[PDB]
RNA sequence: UUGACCUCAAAUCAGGUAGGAGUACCCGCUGAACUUAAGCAUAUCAAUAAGCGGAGGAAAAGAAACCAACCGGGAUUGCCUUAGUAACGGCGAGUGAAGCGGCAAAAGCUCAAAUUUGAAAUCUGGUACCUUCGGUGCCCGAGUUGUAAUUUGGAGAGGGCA
RNA sequence: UCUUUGUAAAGUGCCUUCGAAGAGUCGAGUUGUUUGGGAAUGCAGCUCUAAGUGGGUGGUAAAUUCCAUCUAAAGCUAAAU
RNA sequence: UUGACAUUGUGAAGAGACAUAGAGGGUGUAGAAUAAGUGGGAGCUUCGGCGCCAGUGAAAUACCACUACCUUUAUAGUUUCUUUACUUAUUCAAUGAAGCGGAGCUGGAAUUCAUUUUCCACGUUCUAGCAUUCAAGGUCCCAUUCGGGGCUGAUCCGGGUU
């Protein structure tokens, strides 16, 4: 829904990958540092960006390093992403199917993403992370067997629906 | 890694999910043209092990071929010859339909070069394939040595000389004792053993 | 493994409330045909006693009616004939010989029914009575295949510890499987519903 | 309401490319018949001629899902030989290979599939400059439904040690 | 002959943990063609549709049991011609 | 031309039996007694009660189970038939894909058994005339210029051309 999406995208707006200017800036930083302090790429801090990309995320799931996984209600070759609910349920990592790979695109400075994943998280927002994990698990992972039993689709068109319902009304009732 | 999952899912065809997807896509593909452009490979795994690298120049086309035997011409059935050769309905056209798809998109995108192809779908009337063409004059492929062999002009129309994936099957080219009529090529191995070789000092 | 459940072991000893000798019962499962020559037709030696009471009607003759006064249950003859055909039923199984096979046509209407006689399967008319009596008072099992598919037998007592009863359920697995005819199916150890006499059933 | 995404189009858009000729050799398709069978219906001619598609200085094939059954050989092609043999066949007329051996030439290999995840490290294009079949900087794009390095079955990867 | 581009790249010894390897394809039934290929050599139409100590081959069909050989269903490459 | 398989799906009937439990059913002699068969077995429950024994018959029981035999499906997915019902595949036809489907609005047939339970209508027929300018009117803006804009006139809702 829109509430949990708003909270989730505040969380991911806190964690974006490095853009071009940031990378060139830290290039100048480490070009100064290795030439002067000779720190083996450790004068720069450890990154906390969002992990993404589909083979990347599937590898992080299979090695259980993910904290949270987000998935689109999209990509038209759907066989790309129908196994990620089963992987996240098999490996215990929580997961939520968010609307639109467009928003997942804009949080990662790309056009389409179709996945997003947190593996690290700083100590400031562990509680908000856990609250989102709780809400998502209330929604998606715990209903997984029941949704696995439901058969979607089958809703008739509205002209057929109205004809069906009038025929069903006049045959059993008046 | 997640092409192994697509690989194994695509191996499970008549399961309920893939026959749902197969039905929606045979509908969608039947509503478009006979040969049209695929914006993105519908099977990234199967395109990817045939040589697709998703960068500027690789193009997928998606192509309908009419499906069945080859009703011979020679009108009103008369072959004018021995009753050995008097058949019309049951003759079967030695090139596969996958080869016909590759050859037709080779003619329509004549600047491009066919690389391989793969099946996508079938009803009774049609088979639908996707061809994995390469644009050889593009500067991203004239460089990058793993794929610049397509730029050499001996590979103009690999599809029409049986040089693609399904061509070398349909020419029967493999090693073995089961391919002695066509192992180096059918007609070269014909002609080298109908040729009377004569020397100067006749043995 | 047969170690997680009881199956002959210490785990099922307090489930039954009867403090009397309650024996364990193993049931084999193998689809056979309706015939009588197929199946597992053999009664082997059970190394530990089943702890049952059984008295033997040894109706012997000259050369064999002397070794019953040392290690046996009852001493009988062939002259006492007007008892085992009309009234008396105080027996569990008999034991005969081959020297007198013309008295066997007389004890059939009363003892062949409740398994008190011999027809064709159990080692009842065995001649040797100086060594086979250390095997029958230590009560054996009962391998008798029925009409369609069951094999109900008895291994030992549930109150017996898991030290005597450790090579008894293993030696009995090698009898209904290796004297097996080719009218048996794959995985002849298919279903083993093992319940003793009173408690729940423990199966593999 | 603005801003993205997917998909699909149009511009005498920017820059490219395909078409035809020759066609003696080479790769496919399609495909006869006269002929021989002292007739003729399978057969043979013939996997040919004519038709059609596609290339080059050669093409094709090719580094084994091979040949063997040996004391084992080792990508492909070619010659000599096996051999008018095994085998097919109105078992008629006829058709008819291959492995082994001897030489000629000798040459190997590359992707998909493994997270670089303390860093798409990749590329086209436009522009500026130049030691302008290209090189460097910058900017839009392609691309993480995944480009680079690493690896390819003979090995190879991760750690550990000398 | 001017740079030394390199704290880069590659090679090799031992131990451990591994080791991903190409599907409407393989294979099969039938049908047409073809081959020396004969209970079916190759190809192709349709119908069925795989496997993982698996798959193929081992030139008579099949069941059963070993043995040997290679690894298909992606791709490039001169010269002998 | 006729059949089989494929394209080829989704509801509602009638029988064959499987996941999944349990109530009960199963009366030729004898035997407390309806023992469809088998295994353990002399005892259990506070007691009662049955049971061992006794006797019987081809089968001896209290107490716990397996196979089974005929029902009972209340829980889930498959079969060959009912020809039924579906629209989303496939098929046909028409239109410069124009007014479909549902609901409402007035009238009116309609009889009320509580109040509307109901369906029909819902701008044009003496006349070879006319019908076109985001539509006149009404109503609110704008900044009054000379004009423009919104709603209604022309009921909403779902975009399934029908």
The first and second tokens of residue B49, run together, are 């092990």
CA B74/CA C146 separation, integer angstroms: 75
Is B190 near chain A, with CB under 8 Å? no
CA C68/CA A92 separation, integer angstroms: 73
Length of chain C: 204
Biggest CA-to-CA distance, chain A? 91
B148-171 core/surface letters (b: 16 or more CB in 10 A; e: else):
eebeeeebeebbeebebbbbeebb
H/E run at residue A115: strand A115-118
* Residues contacting A155, CB < 8 A, separation 6+: A161
CB C58 within 8 A of CB C94: yes
D4: residue with closest CA to C1': A102
CA A15/CA A122 separation, integer angstroms: 10
CA A147/CA A153 separation, integer angstroms: 13
Q: What is the DSSP letter of C157?
A: B
This PDB structure is determined at a resolution in Å of: 3.4
Nearest to C51 by CA among C77, C21, C73, C31: C21
A 62-91 residues inside an 8 A Cβ radius of B: 77-80, 82-83
CA A84/CA A73 separation, integer angstroms: 12
**Which residues does chain A have within 8 Å of residue B11's beta carbon, measured at their own beta carbons?**
none
Q: After which residues is chain B broken (C to N over 2.5 A)?
A: none
Give residue A26's region: left, alpha or beta (phi > 0; psi -120 to 50): alpha
H/E run at residue B108: helix B97-108
Nearest to C137 by CA among C194, C76, C70, C78: C70
The first and second tokens of residue B46, run together, are 């199967």
> Does the C-beta of B124 come within 7 A of strand F?
yes
Chains interfacing with C (3 or more CB pairs < 8 Å): none
Report yes or no on chains B and A touching (3+ CB pairs under 8 A): yes
DSSP state string for A20-48: HHHHHHHHHHHHHHHHHT--SS-SSPPP-
Radius of gyration over every alpha carbon of chain C, rounded to an integer in angstroms: 19
CA A69/CA A144 separation, integer angstroms: 15
CB A93 within 8 A of CB A61: yes
The structure tokens 């090698």 sit at: C174
The first and second tokens of residue A21, run together, are 């200017």
CA B6/CA A114 separation, integer angstroms: 15
Nearest to C71 by CA among C141, C140, C137, C139: C137
Q: Is A148 exposed, middle or buried (0-12, 13-18, 19+ CB in 10 A)?
A: exposed
3-state secondary structure labels for all residues of C118-153: CCCCCCCCCCCCCCHHHCCCCCCCCCCCCCCCCEEC
Looking at chain A, which residue has its C-alpha nearest residue B41? A77
The structure tokens 């100067």 sit at: B200
| Minimum distance, in Å, between the CA of residue A62 and any CA atom of chain B | 9
Chains interfacing with B (3 or more CB pairs < 8 Å): A
Nearest Cβ partner of B9 from A54, A58, A79? Answer: A79
Nearest to C27 by CA among C189, C162, C185, C164: C189
CA C152/CA A166 separation, integer angstroms: 65
The first and second tokens of residue C75, run together, are 């001493």
Q: Where are the alpha helices (DSSP H) in chain A?
A: 2-13, 20-36, 54-62, 84-90, 101-106, 126-136, 144-149, 158-172
Inter-axis angle of helices A2-13 and A126-136, nearest 10:
150
CA C105/CA C52 separation, integer angstroms: 29
CA B54/CA B56 separation, integer angstroms: 7
* Proportion of chain B in helix, strand, coil states, percent, rounded to 5: 35, 15, 55
> Does the C-beta of B170 come within 7 A of strand E?
yes
The structure tokens 């992990």 sit at: A51
Helices (H), strands (E): how many in chain B? Answer: 7, 4
Q: What is the DSSP letter of A50?
A: P
This entry's atomic model was obtained through cryo-EM
Sheet arrangement for strand C193-195: C151-152, C25-28, C193-195, C202-203
CA C17/CA C73 separation, integer angstroms: 31
**Which residues does chain B have within 8 Å of residue A83's beta carbon, measured at their own beta carbons?**
2, 5, 9
CB < 7 Å to strand F — which of 33-92 in chain C? 50-53, 86-90
């Amino acid at each position: 829904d829109r509430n949990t999406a708003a909270e989730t995208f505040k969380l991911f707006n806190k964690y974006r990958p490095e853009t071009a200017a940031e990378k060139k800036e830290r290039l100048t930083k480490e070009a100064a540092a290795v030439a002067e302090g000779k720190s083996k790429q450790d004068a720069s801090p450890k990154p906390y960006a969002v992990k993404y990309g589909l083979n990347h995320v599937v590898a992080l799931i299979e090695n259980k390093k993910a904290k949270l996984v987000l998935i689109a209600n999209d990509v038209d070759p759907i066989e790309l992403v129908v196994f990620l609910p089963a992987l996240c349920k098999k490996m215990g990592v929580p997961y939520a199917i968010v609307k639109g790979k467009a928003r997942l695109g804009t949080l990662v400075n790309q056009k389409t993403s179709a996945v997003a994943a947190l593996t690290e998280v700083r100590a400031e927002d562990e509680a908000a992370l856990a609250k989102l994990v709780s809400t998502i698990d209330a929604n998606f992972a715990d209903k997984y067997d029941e949704v696995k039993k439901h058969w979607g689709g089958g809703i008739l068109g509205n002209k057929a629906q109205a004809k069906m319902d009038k025929r069903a009304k006049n045959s059993d009732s008046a | 890694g997640a092409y192994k999952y697509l690989e194994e899912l695509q191996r499970k065809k008549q399961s309920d999910v893939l026959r749902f997807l197969q039905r929606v896509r045979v509908w969608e593909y039947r509503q478009k043209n006979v040969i049209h452009r695929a914006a993105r490979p519908t099977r990234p795994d199967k395109a990817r092990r045939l040589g697709y690298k998703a960068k500027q120049g690789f193009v997928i086309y998606r192509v309908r071929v009419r499906r069945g035997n080859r009703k011979r011409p020679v009108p009103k059935g008369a072959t004018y010859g021995k009753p050995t050769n008097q058949g019309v309905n049951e003759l079967k056209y030695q090139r596969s339909l996958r080869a016909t798809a590759e050859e037709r998109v080779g003619r329509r995108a004549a600047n491009l070069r066919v690389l391989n192809s793969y099946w996508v779908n079938q009803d009774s009337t049609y088979k639908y394939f996707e061809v994995i063409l390469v644009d050889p004059q593009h500067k991203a492929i004239r460089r990058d040595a793993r794929y610049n062999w397509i730029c050499d002009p001996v590979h103009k129309h690999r599809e029409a000389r049986g040089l693609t994936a399904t061509g070398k099957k349909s020419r029967g080219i493999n090693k073995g004792h089961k391919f002695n009529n066509t192992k180096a090529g059918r007609r070269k191995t014909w002609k080298r053993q109908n040729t009377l070789s004569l020397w100067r000092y006749r043995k | 493994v047969k170690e997680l459940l009881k199956y002959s072991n210490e785990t099922k000893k307090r489930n039954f409330l009867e403090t009397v000798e309650l024996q364990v019962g193993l049931k084999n499962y193998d689809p056979q045909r309706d015939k009588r020559f197929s199946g597992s037709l053999k009664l082997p030696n059970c190394p530990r006693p089943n702890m049952s009471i059984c008295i033997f009607g040894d109706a012997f003759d000259v050369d064999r009616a002397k070794s019953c006064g040392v290690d046996a249950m009852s001493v009988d003859d062939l002259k006492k004939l007007n008892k085992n055909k009309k009234l008396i039923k105080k027996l569990s199984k008999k034991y005969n010989a081959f020297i007198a096979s013309e008295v066997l046509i007389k004890q059939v209407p009363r003892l062949l029914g409740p398994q008190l006689s011999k027809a064709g399967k159990f080692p009842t008319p065995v001649s040797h009575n100086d060594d086979l009596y250390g095997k029958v008072t230590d009560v054996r099992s009962t391998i008798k295949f029925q009409l369609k598919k069951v094999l109900c037998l008895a291994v030992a007592v549930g109150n017996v510890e898991m030290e005597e009863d450790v090579l008894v359920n293993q030696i009995l697995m090698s009898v209904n499987f290796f004297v097996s005819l080719l009218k048996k199916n794959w995985q002849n150890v298919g279903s083993l519903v093992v319940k003793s006499s009173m408690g729940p059933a423990f199966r593999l």
